[PDB]
Ligand binder design. Structure first.
Ligand SMILES: *[C@@H]1O[C@H](CO[C@@H]2O[C@@H](C)[C@@H](O)[C@@H](O)[C@@H]2O)[C@@H](O[C@@H]2O[C@H](CO)[C@@H](O)[C@H](O)[C@H]2NC(C)=O)[C@H](O)[C@H]1NC(C)=O
Ligand SMILES: [Ca+2]
Ligand SMILES: [Ca+2]
Ligand SMILES: [Ca+2]
Ligand SMILES: [Ca+2]
Ligand SMILES: [Ca+2]
Ligand SMILES: [Ca+2]
Ligand SMILES: [K+]
Ligand SMILES: [K+]
Ligand SMILES: [K+]
Ligand code: NA
Length: 551
């Protein structure tokens, strides 16, 4: 409630300067591995100015920009100073195990027609090169001149090669959303011929909307990647993956169309830890939503549980859900833009309860309050590898301000585990679901972020806080449905586990058991008895991960 969660470390780790943290207009931020060396770099969309690629130097304890102003540098093209970048994400589009980097540029346009193309950078011929406008693609209808906002990776058919969802901002009947991916039939990767196509129309997502936020993962799907678009001046879309690379909108039916509000930052999470994916998002000067997935009438239906404080209107941009203090409960961070007046950032803990809905608790964001911050973007990542998530905030639009960097103040003695699933080709498995079964605390769910938070993309890591507890096993579900269950050894606690795509006896913890298919599932205590309920509360009710006894 009262103790400050964050300390600013900007001045020691990323001081305002010309080269690495300029006073400029920045927008989205994405975390990926740019130099294939295992560590993650932080890619910043420069709206007026170069894009930044920040790499942690342990010797100096600094984030240093490696996209230096040097034409001979392999990173030089990434600067794209002429591009007015807003959205960014990174995804392996060609299946080489390395991520490409997409910048949505919005030069001279709020909406409709823009004057400079988006960029999709790939490392080849020993340097980063734009492939959207190269010989192969320039006439293939994949580089267009539209305003837009967020982008996100989508493993559309479970192939392990990503499509990139492009949330364009239409003006009338100009500027539909796009879904860009590799065209295998026109590609020859042995010769570096990477042919792209837009499949938005055939996939069912070619819509004319005021695009804002996007999130991707198994929301209604058990394993396949659905797409949630929180738009403005109209309904949100909840694109249910049909299993054949196509999507059908289900938002109105599911109760998340929210047609009279204007979405910004968005994240997918399981707040009540019932294994069903929930949706949190900010509404621009509107009632922020925390939608728990429920199953009313055998049909799926989301229910808002936002408290009055949580839903208090603000000029929200970035929304992130993460366990900043490793205490097992997710926090939600709101990066507000102080464009007309002071507008403090907000932090809430969402506390799973034994009975009923989670409890929403306002926290003190400490140095991350930033009442004068023009917040435009942000990410979480553990860039220094100490097991505590770090927070980076970008600022811009209406006032040039440097990036800010924060470390957490709380939960140092709590346990943690970080899980990194890989695709069948060795890339970050964006869109994968990771479930951690704890010894006594039930099951925690993460989705690896392919794009979230409005304009951003978080590190490709399922970061679990374990509090005082320990892990029994992990379970990874890839978008294609492959599921791997693995015990976590004692010595693997408080570390990063890599989980490879599949080319010890299983521990499922309390409330769960290994089924005939080899995977952990809920134990039904009500039938697995010596009878569990006492005389005075004799009716047993089975729950996911537990049970309750009532009268
Ligand atoms: C892609 O699949 C959709 C959905 O197919 C239905 O749901 C799937 C999960 C599976 O159960 C299928 O057998 C179902 O048909 C197709 O849309 C359906 O198409 C049929 C045939 O025209 C139609 O009668 C259904 O009403 C459609 N259902 C929905 C929900 O739209 C779609 O045609 C498939 N497209 C391609 C190109 O394969
Ligand atoms: Ca790296
Ligand atoms: Ca690649
Ligand atoms: Ca849930
Ligand atoms: Ca927490
Ligand atoms: Ca850290
Ligand atoms: Ca149970
Ligand atoms: K730029
Ligand atoms: K909306
Ligand atoms: K702010
Ligand atoms: Na654009």
């Amino acid at each position: 409630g009262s103790e400050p969660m964050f300390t600013a470390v900007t001045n020691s780790v990323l001081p305002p300067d010309y080269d690495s943290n300029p006073t400029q207009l920045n927008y989205g931020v994405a975390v990926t591995d740019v130099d294939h060396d295992g560590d993650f770099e932080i890619v910043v969309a420069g709206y007026t100015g170069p894009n930044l690629v920040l790499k942690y130097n342990r010797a100096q304890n600094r984030l240093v920009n490696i996209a230096v102003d040097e034409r001979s540098s392999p990173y030089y093209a990434l600067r794209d100073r002429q591009g007015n970048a807003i959205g960014v994400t990174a995804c392996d589009i060609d299946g080489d195990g390395r991520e490409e980097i997409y910048f949505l540029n919005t030069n001279n346009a709020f909406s409709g027609v823009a004057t400079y193309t988006d960029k999709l950078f790939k490392f080849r011929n020993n340097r980063w090169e734009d492939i959207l406008s190269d010989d192969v693609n320039v006439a293939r209808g994949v580089a267009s001149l539209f305003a837009g906002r967020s982008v996100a990776c989508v493993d559309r058919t479970g192939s392990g090669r990503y499509s990139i969802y492009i949330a364009n901002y239409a003006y009338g009947d100009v500027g539909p959303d796009a879904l860009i991916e590799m065209d295998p039939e026109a590609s020859d990767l042995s010769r570096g011929i990477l042919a792209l196509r837009d499949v938005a129309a055939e996939a069912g997502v070619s819509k004319y909307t005021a695009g804002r936020g996007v999130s991707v993962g198994p929301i209604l799907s058990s394993s396949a990647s659905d797409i949630f678009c929180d738009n403005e001046n109209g309904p949100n879309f909840l694109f249910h993956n049909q299993g054949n690379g196509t999507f059908v909108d289900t938002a109105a039916s599911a109760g998340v169309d929210d047609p009279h509000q204007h979405g910004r930052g968005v994240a997918l999470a399981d707040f009540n830890r019932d294994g069903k994916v929930d949706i949190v998002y900010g509404n621009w000067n509107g009632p922020h939503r925390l939608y728990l997935q429920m199953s009313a009438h055998g049909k799926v239906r989301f229910r808002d549980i936002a408290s009055p404080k949580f839903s208090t209107p603000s000029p929200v941009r970035t929304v992130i859900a993460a366990d900043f203090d490793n205490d097992q409960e997710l926090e939600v961070f709101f990066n507000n833009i102080a464009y007309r007046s002071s507008s403090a950032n907000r932090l809430f803990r969402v506390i799973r309860r034994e009975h009923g809905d989670p409890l929403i608790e306002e926290l003190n964001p400490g140095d991350a309050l930033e009442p004068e911050g023009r917040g435009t973007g942000g990410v979480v990542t553990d860039f220094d590898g100490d097991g505590m998530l770090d927070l980076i905030l970008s600022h811009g639009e209406s006032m040039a301000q440097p990036l800010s960097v924060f470390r957490g103040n709380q939960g140092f003695s709590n346990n943690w585990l970080r899980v990194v699933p890989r695709t069948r080709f060795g890339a970050f498995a964006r869109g994968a679901k990771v479930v951690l079964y704890t010894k006594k605390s039930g099951a925690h769910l993460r989705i690896i972020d392919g794009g979230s938070g409005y304009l951003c993309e978080m590190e490709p890591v399922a970061h679990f806080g374990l509090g005082r507890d320990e892990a029994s096993s992990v379970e990874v579900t890839w978008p294609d449905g492959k599921m791997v269950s693995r015990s976590v050894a004692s010595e693997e606690m408080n570390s990063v586990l890599e989980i490879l795509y599949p080319q010890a006896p299983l521990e499922c913890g309390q409330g769960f058991s290994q089924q005939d298919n080899g995977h952990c599932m809920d134990t039904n205590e009500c039938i697995q008895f010596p009878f569990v309920c006492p005389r005075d509360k004799p009716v047993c009710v089975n729950t996911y991960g537990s049970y309750r006894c009532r009268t």
